[PDB]
Amino acid sequence: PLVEFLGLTFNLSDMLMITITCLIVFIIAVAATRSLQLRPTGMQNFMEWVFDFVRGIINSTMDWQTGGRFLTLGVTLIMYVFVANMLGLPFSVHVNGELWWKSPTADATVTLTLAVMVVALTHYYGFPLKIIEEFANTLTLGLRLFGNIYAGEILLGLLASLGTHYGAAIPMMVWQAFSIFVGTIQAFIFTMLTMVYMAHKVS
Amino acid sequence: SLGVLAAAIAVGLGALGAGIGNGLIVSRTIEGIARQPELRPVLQTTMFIGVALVEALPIIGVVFSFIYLGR
Amino acid sequence: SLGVLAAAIAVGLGALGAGIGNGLIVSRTIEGIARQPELRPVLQTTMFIGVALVEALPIIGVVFSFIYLGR
Amino acid sequence: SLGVLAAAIAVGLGALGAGIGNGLIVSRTIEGIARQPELRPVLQTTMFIGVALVEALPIIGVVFSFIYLGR
Amino acid sequence: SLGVLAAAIAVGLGALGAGIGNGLIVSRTIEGIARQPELRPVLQTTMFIGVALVEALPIIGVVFSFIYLGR
Amino acid sequence: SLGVLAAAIAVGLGALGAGIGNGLIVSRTIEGIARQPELRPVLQTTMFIGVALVEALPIIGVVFSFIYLGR
Amino acid sequence: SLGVLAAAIAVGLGALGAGIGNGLIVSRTIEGIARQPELRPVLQTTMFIGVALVEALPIIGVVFSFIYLGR
Amino acid sequence: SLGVLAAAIAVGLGALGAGIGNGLIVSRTIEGIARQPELRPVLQTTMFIGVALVEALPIIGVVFSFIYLGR
Amino acid sequence: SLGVLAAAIAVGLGALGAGIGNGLIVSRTIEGIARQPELRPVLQTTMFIGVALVEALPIIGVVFSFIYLGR
Amino acid sequence: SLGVLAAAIAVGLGALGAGIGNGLIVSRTIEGIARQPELRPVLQTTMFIGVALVEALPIIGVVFSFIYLGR
Amino acid sequence: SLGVLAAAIAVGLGALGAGIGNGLIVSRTIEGIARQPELRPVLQTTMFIGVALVEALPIIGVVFSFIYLGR
Amino acid sequence: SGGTIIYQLLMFIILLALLRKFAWQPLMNIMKQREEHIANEID
Amino acid sequence: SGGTIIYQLLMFIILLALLRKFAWQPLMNIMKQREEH
């Protein structure tokens, strides 16, 4: 399970998982936003429910006039992190090489650069103790999502090997239901703490 | 040889801290919804928000324990 | 050599964290049902949800203890 | 060598966790039966299932200490 | 060689857990009989079944520390 | 050679557990004294049997510590 | 060799301290928004600056843990 | 040999237990004087006999620490 | 050669103490602003000077850990 | 040699126990003179005798740490 | 040799005890000035003499840590 | 080929089957509650 | 570690703008239209 990199500069498998999660998020977004309907049904009501959910979170943290801009960053951020956490659970394939296609959030560099991208955005829209608190909250957000996905990934993998090598269906079943629970809770706390620091720096 | 019990005390103290923090949060949530049932959805919402926040920093100790077992 | 000691302190600190957290949440739910006895099913269902969410990290400590025992 | 020290530290941490958690549960349920003494069977069944959880994770801790002593 | 220190940490951690548990139980029952004085026999019977209930696992930790001292 | 360390930590953990348990029971039995004066004999009898309960295990610990030092 | 265990106790004690601190803060803000639910933002901002403090000292601890690891 | 740190860890755990127990009981005597300042003699005499009870087992531990240091 | 272990236990215990102290202070001050809102600035200043004290002792602990690892 | 480790440990656990006990007694006397300020001198004087009582034995541990450092 | 981690366990346990006791004192003084605001100078003066009284013993633990490190 | 892939994918499928027997009734009722609420708010 | 950080940063900016323009500024227009309606 080594870091398989075709190029010396960057991990190849992480780029593959970022591309596949971007395409699956984009196609579920355009499948939920096919046509305009004033009476919501099907999946457009689901997309509007996620949209008003993100909006509600923004309304909890800040005034609606200040935080109205962030709604379309926040909904793609929660859906992106949501699908990025749930991709690691079904397949997690092992090839004759090092490793291929685990999940993007299990990579530490992916989650830490997504967290520092979040904080770069909330510095863009917006004394040593304040800046060390800033670097502290960046790295604890990135390490939060990275750890709480990567431990479950390793455990699921361990369970998979224990089952295949030699009766053990329900422990990994209970853990895998708990892991999609961890995925949706981590996506929600990630976008909510994103909007908290956005509200803290805007107003 | 020493990295194994290094990883073990790391994951053990993480489990201890997350257990105490989760216990404090969840116990106060259920006594709060015992005080009144009309706010149990928002108290369960902030319950899971709190459980994530107290189970967040021990799991970075867990994955760092795996790093310690690596070296 | 040190792997069995590693495994044991890992499962022991997991047991300590799960015991303190479960003791807190169960004690507050029984004083909650002592305060208002017609809220017993909601209180004990949220209590079992709390048992799961305080024993999340000790259970993974147990299987990582088996990893530590295996090495 | 280290296996007996492992088994004993697992039993010791499980006993300490079970002691604190069950002490919290039993203490709050006798003050709850001191408040409203007509709720004796509900409080006793809920303290018994809570104690069953708080004991039963150090129970598997103790049998894991037995297989640590065997190794 | 380490079996005596093993039995020692086992009996000591079981003693600390039983001490905190019995302290919680007897403390809350003494404020409970301080509140409602005519509930003294029910509170004492539930207190003694709680004391035996929380020292169940420390005394089996002691009688396992004996065979830890042997092995 | 480590039997002296074994006996010493057994006595120390017994003293720490007995100190916490006696602190809890004496502290809120004098709270019970301070709330109402007339129940001083029944509060003190339950107090001293609680002292017996939280000190008994500790006493066993120090006797077994002398057995450990003899080993 | 011992730098691995040094980094491990550093991250473990930091995780334990951050877990207990975050658990206390989010616990009492659960009961704060349960007593007076219209005070949710004024409780929430002070909650997050407390979370920032109780993580930011174990965060510089876990930043120092890697230079403990290297040596 | 290591009997010196044996004696010292006995002194330290006895001091920790005596400190926590004495702190609890004298703190709640202050709380009881604040609730009702006209029973200061009975509160202080039950305080000092509780201080004797919490202090007794660490003093027994420290005289055994003297017998442990020699060996 | 144990200066890395020295500095790391120093930073870890300072982080644990600062975490528990900051958790207590921030939790009680959000309960203070929760039971009445109109002097949140009065509460916050005394909260920050308490945070300053309970971290200013582990800050000099961290600096002393730096000069421990230097030796 | 290891007597330095002995003395430091005694000093450290004496400081920890004195810190927790003094924190309890001073914190509850803050609450006590906060609720009824007209009583302040008599409860702060019995707070000071409680302070001397809770830190009597850690000073004895400091003197014994001088003895252990001499050995 | 081991005097550096002797110095460090002294500083670490002193910082942990000072953190817990100081957090208790400051938390009770802000809930005291929260529930009645007019006694802020009185409660802050007795809080500052209380925190000086708590951290008196960890500071002499730090200078004893200095003479342990010099050893 | 590895053995873990089809094994955990098969149990992910049967976990979705259990979650289908358990979970299509709540969230479709939540979506129907939102749809009926906003339809009553419109008409 | 790795060097994917500028890759997924630029790809996230591209995906953000592309998604917003192709899906959710029209969804916000539908929401504002039904709010005024």
DSSP string of C24-41, one letter each residue: HHHHHHHHHHHH-GGGHH
The whole-angstrom distance between A36's CA and the closest CA on chain B is 32
Q: Which domain covers residue G33, as residue numbers? A: 1-71
Q: Supply the DSSP string of B53-70, one letter for each residue.
A: HHTHHHHHHHHHHHHHHH
Residue type, B2: L
Rg from Cα positions in chain C: 16
J17 touches chain K (CB under 8 A): yes
Q: Are B68 and B10 in contact (CB under 8 A)?
A: yes
| Joined tokens for residue G11 | 């991250």
Q: Supply the CATH number for residue K27's domain.
A: 1.20.20.10
Closest CA to J68 of J19, J26, J16, J14: J14
Integer CA distances (angstroms), I54 to C69, G63, K23, K41, in order = 39, 20, 7, 20
Q: Are I64 and K59 in contact (CB under 8 A)?
A: no
- Chain J residues touching residue K16 (CB < 8 angstroms): 16, 19
Residue F49 CB neighbours (<10 A): 17
Kindly give, in sequence order, each residue whose CB lies less than 8 Å from that of residue C34, ignoring residues fewer than 6 positions away: D29, D32, D33, D35, D36, D39, D43
| Joined tokens for residue A13 | 């498998």
Give the residue on G whose Cα is nearest the Cα of B36. G34
Kindly give, in sequence order, each residue whose CB lies less than 8 Å from that of residue H10, ignoring residues fewer than 6 positions away: F8, F9, F11, F12, F15, H61, H62, H64, H65, H68
J52 touches chain H (CB under 8 A): no
The whole-angstrom distance between F25's CA and the closest CA on chain E is 4
The C-alpha atoms of residue H19 and residue B38 are separated, in whole angstroms, by 44
Contact A178 C60 (CB under 8 A): no
Backbone angles phi, psi at A92, to 5 degrees: 45, 65
The C-alpha atoms of residue A127 and residue B35 are separated, in whole angstroms, by 43
Closest CA to D24 of H34, A202, E21: E21
Rg from Cα positions in chain I: 16
Integer CA distances (angstroms), J22 to A81, G21, J52, in order = 48, 21, 9
Give the residue on E whose Cα is nearest the Cα of F58. E15
Residue G70 CB neighbours (<10 A): 9
Q: Are I34 and B32 in contact (CB under 8 A)?
A: no
| Joined tokens for residue C7 | 């495994």
Q: Which residue has the tokens 């629970």?
A: A181
The C-alpha atoms of residue H64 and residue H59 are separated, in whole angstroms, by 8
Closest CA to F28 of H2, A137, E23: E23
The C-alpha atoms of residue E70 and residue G35 are separated, in whole angstroms, by 57
Long-range interactions of E33-36: CB distance < 8 A, separation 24+? E33/D34, E33/F32, E33/F39, E33/F42, E33/F43, E33/F46, E34/F29, E34/F31, E34/F32, E34/F33, E34/F35, E34/F36, E34/F39, E34/F43, E35/D34, E35/D35, E36/D34, E36/D37
Closest CA to B34 of C51, C43, D37: C43
The C-alpha atoms of residue M22 and residue K67 are separated, in whole angstroms, by 70
Helix axes K40-54, I40-69, angle to 10 degrees: 20
Provide the CB-side half-sphere exposure for J28 (13 A, CA): 26
The whole-angstrom distance between A80's CA and the closest CA on chain L is 21
Q: Are I2 and K5 in contact (CB under 8 A)?
A: yes
- Do G and M make contact via 3 or more CB pairs under 8 A? The reply is no
The C-alpha atoms of residue G14 and residue B14 are separated, in whole angstroms, by 9
Closest CA to D57 of D25, D26, D21: D21
Q: Write down the experimental method used for this entry.
A: cryo-EM
Kindly give, in sequence order, each residue whose CB lies less than 8 Å from that of residue E27, ignoring residues fewer than 6 positions away: D27, F24, F25, F27, F28, F29, F50
The C-alpha atoms of residue A63 and residue A195 are separated, in whole angstroms, by 12
- Work out how many CB contacts closer than 8 A connect F with H: 144
The C-alpha atoms of residue J1 and residue I60 are separated, in whole angstroms, by 26
The C-alpha atoms of residue G53 and residue G36 are separated, in whole angstroms, by 25
Q: Which residue has the tokens 């530290």?
A: D9
Closest CA to B20 of A142, C55, K48: C55
Residue I9 CB neighbours (<10 A): 22
The C-alpha atoms of residue B13 and residue G11 are separated, in whole angstroms, by 9
Resolution in A: 3.3
- Chain J residues touching residue K28 (CB < 8 angstroms): 27-28, 30-31
The C-alpha atoms of residue C44 and residue C25 are separated, in whole angstroms, by 10
Contact A173 L11 (CB under 8 A): yes
Residue K56 CB neighbours (<10 A): 16
The C-alpha atoms of residue A201 and residue G48 are separated, in whole angstroms, by 13
Contact D13 C9 (CB under 8 A): yes
J11 touches chain K (CB under 8 A): yes
**Quick one: L34 exposed, middle or buried, by C-beta within 10 A (0-12, 13-18, 19+)?**
middle
Backbone angles phi, psi at E2, to 5 degrees: -85, 0
Kindly give, in sequence order, each residue whose CB lies less than 8 Å from that of residue A131, ignoring residues fewer than 6 positions away: none
J28 touches chain K (CB under 8 A): yes
Q: Are I41 and K42 in contact (CB under 8 A)?
A: no
Q: Are G27 and B27 in contact (CB under 8 A)?
A: yes
Kindly give, in sequence order, each residue whose CB lies less than 8 Å from that of residue M30, ignoring residues fewer than 6 positions away: A36, A38
Residue from the list L8, L35, L42 with its beta carbon closest to the beta carbon of A41: L35
Residue A24 CB neighbours (<10 A): 15
The C-alpha atoms of residue G43 and residue G26 are separated, in whole angstroms, by 10
G44 touches chain A (CB under 8 A): yes
- Chain G residues touching residue A132 (CB < 8 angstroms): 56, 60
Contact I68 K29 (CB under 8 A): no
C27 touches chain B (CB under 8 A): yes
Contact F10 E8 (CB under 8 A): yes
- Chain I residues touching residue G2 (CB < 8 angstroms): 1-2, 4-5
| Joined tokens for residue E45 | 């019977």
Q: SS3 string of G23-65?
A: HHHHHHHHHHHHHCHHHHHHHHHHHHHHHHHHHHHHHHHHHHH
The C-alpha atoms of residue B67 and residue E18 are separated, in whole angstroms, by 37
Contact G55 A200 (CB under 8 A): no
D69 touches chain C (CB under 8 A): no
Closest CA to E32 of H39, F55, F31: F31
The whole-angstrom distance between E19's CA and the closest CA on chain D is 8
| Joined tokens for residue C2 | 């040190």
Helix axes E56-70, E3-35, angle to 10 degrees: 170
The C-alpha atoms of residue H61 and residue H63 are separated, in whole angstroms, by 6
The C-alpha atoms of residue G23 and residue B54 are separated, in whole angstroms, by 6
Q: How far apart are the first and last CA of chain K?
A: 9
B31 touches chain C (CB under 8 A): yes
How many helices (H) and strands (E) would you count in chain L? 1, 0
Closest CA to I59 of I5, I23, I24, I15: I15
- Chain L residues touching residue A163 (CB < 8 angstroms): 4, 7-8
- The verdict on residue A134 lying in a domain is yes
J22 touches chain H (CB under 8 A): yes
Closest CA to B62 of I36, C56, J47: C56
Query: 3-class SS at G68?
Result: helix
Residue from the list G16, G30, G37 with its beta carbon closest to the beta carbon of B47: G30
Q: Are D12 and E7 in contact (CB under 8 A)?
A: no
- Chain J residues touching residue H52 (CB < 8 angstroms): none
Backbone angles phi, psi at I70, to 5 degrees: -65, -25
The C-alpha atoms of residue F19 and residue F26 are separated, in whole angstroms, by 10
Kindly give, in sequence order, each residue whose CB lies less than 8 Å from that of residue D16, ignoring residues fewer than 6 positions away: C16, C19, E13, E14, E16, E17, E20
Kindly give, in sequence order, each residue whose CB lies less than 8 Å from that of residue A174, ignoring residues fewer than 6 positions away: none
**Quick one: I27 exposed, middle or buried, by C-beta within 10 A (0-12, 13-18, 19+)?**
buried
The C-alpha atoms of residue D30 and residue M24 are separated, in whole angstroms, by 58
Closest CA to A176 of L11, B55, B11: L11
Closest CA to F22 of F43, F52, F42: F52
Contact E36 D31 (CB under 8 A): no
The C-alpha torsion from D60 through D63 and D65 to D69, rounded to 10°, is -160
CA angle (I28, I30, I36) in 5-degree steps: 105
Kindly give, in sequence order, each residue whose CB lies less than 8 Å from that of residue A126, ignoring residues fewer than 6 positions away: A201, A202
Kindly give, in sequence order, each residue whose CB lies less than 8 Å from that of residue M25, ignoring residues fewer than 6 positions away: A72
The C-alpha atoms of residue A172 and residue K17 are separated, in whole angstroms, by 42
- Chain A residues touching residue B21 (CB < 8 angstroms): none
The C-alpha atoms of residue E42 and residue E22 are separated, in whole angstroms, by 17
Query: 3-class SS at A7?
Result: coil
Rg from Cα positions in chain E: 16
Contact M16 A33 (CB under 8 A): no
Number of domains making up chain G: 1
- Do M and I make contact via 3 or more CB pairs under 8 A? The reply is no
Closest CA to I4 of J11, B5, B6, G4: G4
Q: How far apart are the first and last CA of chain H?
A: 8
Q: Supply the DSSP string of J2-33, one letter for each residue.
A: HHHHHHHHHHHHHHHHHHHHHHHHHHHHHHHH
Q: Which one of L6, L9, L10, L12 would you mutate to disrupt binding with A, by most A Cβ within 10 Å of its Cβ?
A: L12
- Do L and A make contact via 3 or more CB pairs under 8 A? The reply is yes
F70 touches chain E (CB under 8 A): no
- Chain A residues touching residue B66 (CB < 8 angstroms): 154
The C-alpha atoms of residue B18 and residue H3 are separated, in whole angstroms, by 36
